Design a protein around this ligand. Structure first.
Ligand code: NA
Ligand code: NA
Ligand code: NA
Ligand code: NA
Lengths: 311, 311, 311, 311
């Protein structure tokens, strides 16, 4: 059995990623919450509410509510006030744990030493804080699956940077320098694989509780993604990362490269600068991340349709 | 009649660009020399020698031999010691002018006010110095055709930056902020259109003086480009820029965008950061450059074969 | 009764500062250890050994052994391999606690809420980590006494920066932005008040255990300070800070100003940039630190002689 | 005979510096104008008008009207709209030369090779541009006398930077790296030597044309300097620099040190960072400037009273 922590700035694609793991009988041992997409206290409530819909009592540990050093902005314009459109949900029964996410990560890394996997689909503040307190988690965590970066400089939050890295580039720099086994899925790869109008219409006609929930959660994000980002539909940054974590054959091209995080407050803040070892100069010959450059869209969407037929 | 200055850090593709203009009856009013690809004094001699092969006495004005502020490196590993392989040519009769290129640019902008075009296929130091001395050249020069940048961060001199901009990013920043009418051809566009083994073999069998010269001038560059940069053949960064300046239909996709030059001494030195007006934040809504994103390869190579049949 | 944590990159002046507090019946509730002056594991042993000489069993909590983000250098050339010259001491009985200093700071801030004082005579990594995990410590800690900075740009570790801030300028920036009640004693103030040859000779003739220990601990530092830094004797950066914490009248000039920490990796790394509200432009009108600009040397040395007569 | 160019962002202390040279029979071969203190076209008119009051026809060459790269602000709040209070003077007869100051500097460096001295009491843009066009001026100019910097980080335009360097720190970096023989007079040295109320009253009672002109030109600057900068009277940054150029014994302490110019757009823009070779690390052991740290106030004021008795 595989054991995962999922780290969430909880909006629509975080909820769907949690569900992809659970639907597929992956052991989710904790959900950790970090600043990012929407108001932090609503992110905590979103996760608790999400667990209730699937009858689970997995602990939710609130973590950092701001970056280590930098200021950031939430993006409720992108995801809705509640992260799933403008509805702001509230759990009926479940309550957040008191312990800080960074301390929970250390405890869980000990309990599941050598087998724990970390699904880093959000800003990296909690993982950085856990590392800073206990450097031994680099061996104890088997694998870090990172949704982050823009490896061709086609960013979302700025023209050249991706949101998760940009929110806390100091935390990202710490994580990328620590020695974790990282596989990274960039924004400017996943935008090549949007959910098309044809696919969206198929989902709207499924009429299961899950398909209805997906339509409800994604409508606002789809409108924004199409109108502002000029994406032909909506993207699945976190759900693609999660699908590859579950089934690695969904990734069809990977390269091990050396990634530098820009942690300045300059215009280049949050950029992922990638040495491919093919230029006239080089920064390092030691790769620190396996980067996914292509996926099998058909295989990915098969996992999504399977999830939406759950109930 | 069109009137051009060509600004050269003279290596193989600068020589071929000069010849493309001359073969095609474009009036080249001066050649200006700038630091870059190889030793500066050999760059001056290369240009004088090149003019001799085609019976012209166009003036050659030596300009800047170092960037405004930064240190740089020459790349004789890429182009050969002489910029056309390891041969180091010497003109028999022609001599360089005494006047600094920046002063010649100002004089020529006055003589050809409203019609002068500037083919900026090299680091931008001379054009920047001319602007700094006389800001009025922004109207007097009709068009600046720039070979420069990496708009997907796929660089040559560093992993993320292109050579011409990286050599003198202060000069580039001055040029991009001045208000010139700029059309820019990036490195990470032109590398999609290498001269293939099939095309190279056709050229090797042509047996004209020009085809023999092309083979001689490009052999070293082709070996390096294939082995280090992993290009399938060799690229034509300057000759593509020149071909588009002559015949704009060679460019098949263009976008007007806002380009920021990174002029730090940090790892991101020399990057061209491009706002496409499609992100959650934006730096400016005022474009400053028309960027070429695609070309017609067949049309471009037709111009090259035509040139090689000259004599 | 006043209650203090003392945070040490333990070398000679940290030992003397601990003793100044204890000699004078200030309640020291913990010693916390941070990276800085010498090898981290020897810093832990130095503190344990120091407590043994005065019959105390105060807990010692090892904290960060490296900066949050940056690389740093130890300075055993300045303080000796063991921080008190080249002797490397070892406690006979006392052992370090297991709990991380940052977690101990949070616990102690709760136990002594509203009365706890923090003597920050070292790099600020532990206090920053404690804040990041629990922001409420800003009210619970009554006062932070900081030895740090160079307010006229007369640095020690670099020409323009002071060691404690330079080692971890990210941690410093976090601390200075958090909202603590800070009084700061700069390097380029304390160097105006060295222990003179006259004073040193008086100490060498005292013949108490404490005076003999002081001579032993300071000989290497005095030689280095005089030969390299060109100080006329040796300075007491931490002991002056501590003396002012005990008796505020030792400070004879203070100003509340706005301090910005340079946390770049550029040449200005670690600078404390001070807005005095007297320039043609201003960064903020909100002070964040009370800075000590002058002391009464006679009063300070009276505290030192008193300490050396303890036993 | 000594031969000088004086480079002016012409306000009150530039006018007085020109007069100090002329009163004392130093050959002023040209006045060059640069962006800085007030509107550029008024700076040109100020210089022409100033020459008329002393019956000279020395050529005035307009130079740069903006920094090489950065934006800047004028400071008419400090000097008055006209740079000498709010009066905006106009020459009756003299006209500016057409030739750019940078080209005039090169011509004059050739005409007076080995003897020309450059009084750089303003932003360094013209000298940088002249160097960039002809690097040989570094030997041909005997001496550069620079009013600039803040060597204890006590700035005027920002809390930590001095105006002349801050306006164009790229130009400053070029000048300080070129190899000129530089003696530098910092802002945070000259502010120790203001014109006191006693001295001001003596001047107000002199009743010569020059004393009346001095009172008229300095009233606005004195009010501002006292109220904002908290100076006890008004300072003479340029006139002190000029006095030392004329009589070196006015400087009573000098040190040869290594000065780095901060040419970023960060908060530290325009800082002069000085390596004294006394820190635990060092940037270079090669000095590039002789810095004046103290003057004889009595000797300086004797030169001023002598000037005011001219007519
Ligand atoms: Na997320
Ligand atoms: Na070129
Ligand atoms: Na310390
Ligand atoms: Na001036």
């Amino acid at each position: 059995m595989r054991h995962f922590i999922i780290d969430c700035d909880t909006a629509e694609d975080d909820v769907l990623s949690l569900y992809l793991l659970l639907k597929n009988n992956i052991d989710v041992v904790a959900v950790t919450i970090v600043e990012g997409n929407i108001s932090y206290e609503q992110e905590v409530k979103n996760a608790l509410w999400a667990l209730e819909q699937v009858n689970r009592e997995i602990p939710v540990y609130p973590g950092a509510n701001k970056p280590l050093l930098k200021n950031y902005i939430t993006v409720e314009k992108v995801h809705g006030k509640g992260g799933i459109g403008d509805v702001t949900v509230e759990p009926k029964r479940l309550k957040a744990q008191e312990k800080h996410a960074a301390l929970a990560i250390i405890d869980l890394a000990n309990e599941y030493a050598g087998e724990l996997e970390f699904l880093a689909i959000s800003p990296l503040t909690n993982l950085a804080l856990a590392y800073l307190l206990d450097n031994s988690i680099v061996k104890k965590i088997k694998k870090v699956w990172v949704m982050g970066g823009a490896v061709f400089g086609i960013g979302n939050i700025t023209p050249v940077a991706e949101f998760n890295i940009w929110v806390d580039p100091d935390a990202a720099k710490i994580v990328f320098n620590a020695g974790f086994d990282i596989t990274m899925i960039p924004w400017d790869v996943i935008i090549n694989y949007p959910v098309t109008d044809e696919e969206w219409n198929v989902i709207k006609n499924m009429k299961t509780r899950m398909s209805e929930l997906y339509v409800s959660m994604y409508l606002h994000y789809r409108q924004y993604s199409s109108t502002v980002q000029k994406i032909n539909g909506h993207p699945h940054p976190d759900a693609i990362t999660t699908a590859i974590a579950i089934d690695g054959s969904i990734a069809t091209r990977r390269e091990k490269r050396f990634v530098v995080i820009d942690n300045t407050d300059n215009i280049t803040r949050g950029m992922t600068l990638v040495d491919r070892f093919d230029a006239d100069t080089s920064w390092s010959d030691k790769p620190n991340a396996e980067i996914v450059y292509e996926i099998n869209k058909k295989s990915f969407m098969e996992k999504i349709y399977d999830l939406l037929n759950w109930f």
